[PDB]
Design a protein around this ligand. Structure first.
Ligand SMILES: *S[C@H](CC(=O)NCc1c[nH]nn1)S*
Ligand SMILES: [Zn+2]
Ligand SMILES: [Zn+2]
Ligand SMILES: [Zn+2]
Ligand SMILES: [Zn+2]
Ligand SMILES: [Zn+2]
Ligand SMILES: [Zn+2]
Lengths: 250, 71, 150
């Protein structure tokens, strides 16, 4: 009817309303809340910017203040993700080249699905946090603190030797406790991957020589075999280590 | 003629005869809002519809409603 | 604010039990309108058939701008639901829209039982069994259905 399809609390006839470029119509004040809230949890996703209905991007003159910083973040991430996919050599991947699969001809789409990016609190740019797990994706919501998300460059605890090509723009650290790209940076000293952060009380307590050695899984697992998940020589589990530039070895 | 509700409310309309296979109703779905049959499931009365059964296989009558959920 | 979320939760309830989604019940369990209980019946075609499955639902203060917290309280053998009753469902996380309603979530969960997704599984063991030995998967699913859900 005259019902606003965002908040089913209303007819549009009731307070300030607008028609998106997409065509259908919502309360102005509702569209704003959708765009202020952004995504759920720490990992940047852009589900929220599509139209509740037709799921084409939300657009409007009156909303440009909100959309503008978003488009720029979306740009930043699409850029970084697509790059990482190519460097990682997954752009020819079968999940892109097979007609009728989800991201047929959508390299950017596949990559942003596959990789997990976070907004750094110090600067304000996205950084890479690892392959997105499912286990993190049915974990907590926003029982998290954005101050602890910090890109490699802003948490340079290893005064690391910069990459000549890409300055420090794609610098990444190991989890202190396992063989994974880090996500969080807590107590301004310690890098944690997603799982180890979840379990940081434990992880901190384990004596350094009792930690798993390479190859090391999160939360104290000893992975079987001989090759490191990060394909790098590194110091024993329990010491900080700058992994270098993320694109250039991947 | 029957309707198809998307999860997010967006309704779409289709002309059909009973004997229509759900195969080609997934196809006839692409022709309108253009999604690959391979990603779309159809739910009627809590039953997930099987590719290549009729609609009156499922007792689907004039002016019924299905739901498109997709992976 | 929460009064807004409440007006929306009452609407969804009124809309629901006056036109329920096929094979599911849901509703507040006390006078606290943010805490609901729900049941989903095992779909007719699935090894879960004849089972009644109980869920818990917590609505956030700013519903529906954030999704509800939804879990199984009935043990169930399924690749995308863990031993804590956590459900791997996109529309509850990255793919949530305020246009969705509990009806749509329950319909969505029910479909998930009709047809699991082994590709990105939450329980990779059960995922494996499903992909490699279907007969086995049904047996254990039905067996679990008989122990826990009847
Ligand atoms: S909740 C879990 C992830 C999952 O079950 N499915 C992801 C997916 C993507 N396309 N289809 N299913 S950890
Ligand atoms: Zn509204
Ligand atoms: Zn639209
Ligand atoms: Zn930074
Ligand atoms: Zn580089
Ligand atoms: Zn770790
Ligand atoms: Zn290692």
């Amino acid at each position: 009817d005259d019902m606003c399809m965002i908040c089913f609390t209303e007819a549009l006839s009731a307070a300030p309303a607008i028609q998106l470029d997409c065509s259908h119509i919502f309360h102005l004040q509702c569209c704003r809340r959708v765009l202020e809230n952004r995504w759920l949890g720490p990992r940047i996703t852009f589900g929220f910017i599509s139209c509740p209905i037709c799921k084409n991007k939300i657009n409007h003159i009156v909303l440009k203040d909100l959309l503008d910083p978003i488009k720029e973040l979306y740009e930043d991430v699409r850029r970084k993700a697509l790059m990482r996919l190519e460097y990682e050599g997954l752009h020819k991947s079968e999940a892109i080249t097979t007609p009728g699969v989800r991201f047929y001809n959508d390299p950017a789409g596949y990559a942003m699905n596959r990789y997990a990016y976070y907004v750094c609190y110090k600067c304000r740019k996205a950084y890479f946090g690892g392959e997105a797990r499912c286990d993190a994706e049915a974990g907590r919501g926003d029982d998290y603190d954005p101050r602890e998300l910090i890109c490699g460059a802003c948490s340079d605890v290893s005064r690391a030797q910069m990459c000549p090509k890409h300055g420090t723009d794609f610098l990444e650290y190991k989890c202190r406790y396992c063989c994974s790209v880090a996500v969080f940076f807590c107590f301004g000293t310690t890098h944690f991957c997603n799982a180890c952060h979840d379990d940081f009380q434990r992880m901190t307590s384990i004596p350094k020589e009792e930690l798993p050695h390479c190859p090391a899984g999160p939360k104290g697992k000893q992975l079987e075999g001989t090759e490191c998940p990060l394909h790098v020589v590194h110091p024993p589990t329990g010491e900080e280590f700058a992994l270098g530039c993320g694109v250039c070895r991947n | 003629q029957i309707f198809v509700k998307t999860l997010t409310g967006k309704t779409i309309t289709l002309e059909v005869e009973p004997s229509d296979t759900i195969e080609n109703v997934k196809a006839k779905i692409q022709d309108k809002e253009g999604i690959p049959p391979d990603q779309q499931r159809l739910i009627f009365a809590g039953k997930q519809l099987e590719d290549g059964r009729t609609l009156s296989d499922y007792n689907i009558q004039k002016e019924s409603t299905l739901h498109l959920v997709l992976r | 604010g929460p009064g807004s979320a409440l007006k929306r939760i009452n609407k969804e309830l009124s809309d629901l039990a006056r036109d329920p989604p096929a094979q599911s019940r849901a509703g507040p369990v006390g006078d606290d309108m943010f805490h609901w209980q729900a049941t989903i019946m095992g779909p007719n075609d699935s090894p879960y058939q004849g089972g009644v499955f109980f869920l818990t639902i917590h609505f956030p203060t700013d519903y529906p701008f954030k999704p509800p917290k939804v879990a199984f309280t009935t043990r169930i053998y399924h690749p995308n639901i863990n031993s804590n009753g956590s459900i791997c469902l996109d529309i509850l996380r990255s793919q949530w829209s305020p246009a969705l309603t509990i009806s749509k979530v329950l319909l969505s969960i029910s479909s998930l039982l009709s047809d699991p997704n082994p590709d990105d599984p939450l329980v990779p063991e059960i995922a494996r069994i499903y992909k490699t030995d279907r007969d086995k998967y049904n047996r254990i699913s039905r067996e679990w259905t008989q122990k826990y859900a009847m």
